[PDB]
Amino acid sequence: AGHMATTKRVLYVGGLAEEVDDKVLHAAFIPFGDITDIQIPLDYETEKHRGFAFVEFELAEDAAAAIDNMNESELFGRTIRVNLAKPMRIKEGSSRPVWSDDDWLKKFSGKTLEENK
């Protein structure tokens, strides 16, 4: 990409509350640049998200700014994390995060094994 070994157009968010829906994330990440999409997972044990989500921008340099301006910041009354995860529809990386981004991004982009192989 024009700034890194992978596209900055997509990024990760975590440490959120259970009510931090995709609409609140838009209002929480739009001032750094225009957004294109937002995504939130759901767990089978409660049908709620696990306090983390993804965001997508229409500008790669503005996505890098939103990572630096919201890392270790506050949202919903608690601390949150923000960093460049592996982009969707893709299966490689070389400067990827330290959390379980391998099995998580492969789960949403590769679909889960509960009805597929």
Side-chain angles (χ1 to χ4, degrees):
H3 311 279
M4 193 170 294
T6 203
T7 206
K8 198 69 55 61
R9 299 287 294 270
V10 176
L11 50 143
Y12 159 106
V13 187
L16 310 176
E18 297 83 4
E19 49 172 354
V20 190
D21 288 0
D22 47 6
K23 297 164 286 293
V24 339
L25 291 174
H26 183 289
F29 290 98
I30 186 64
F32 311 114
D34 287 3
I35 282 165
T36 332
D37 198 9
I38 296 186
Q39 170 174 326
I40 298 186
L42 293 173
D43 294 352
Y44 163 90
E45 63 185 352
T46 183
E47 303 185 355
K48 310 288 176 287
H49 76 94
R50 206 170 188 83
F52 92 78
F54 307 104
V55 177
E56 175 181 353
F57 284 71
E58 70 174 7
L59 336 83
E61 59 184 354
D62 286 0
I67 287 169
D68 174 38
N69 279 274
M70 297 297 293
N71 187 209
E72 315 200 351
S73 297
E74 166 178 354
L75 231 296
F76 279 55
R78 62 278 304 293
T79 332
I80 76 160
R81 310 301 184 139
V82 186
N83 46 75
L84 172 62
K86 299 187 303 299
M88 299 178 181
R89 300 179 62 88
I90 288 162
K91 49 61 178 296
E92 69 185 354
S94 66
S95 187
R96 69 185 82 177
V98 319
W99 42 273
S100 298
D101 68 316
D102 286 349
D103 288 351
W104 291 350
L105 277 294
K106 177 177 58 181
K107 170 178 62 179
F108 306 121
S109 183
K111 181 66 182 300
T112 206
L113 56 71
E114 298 293 351
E115 64 180 358
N116 287 120
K117 295 295 180 298

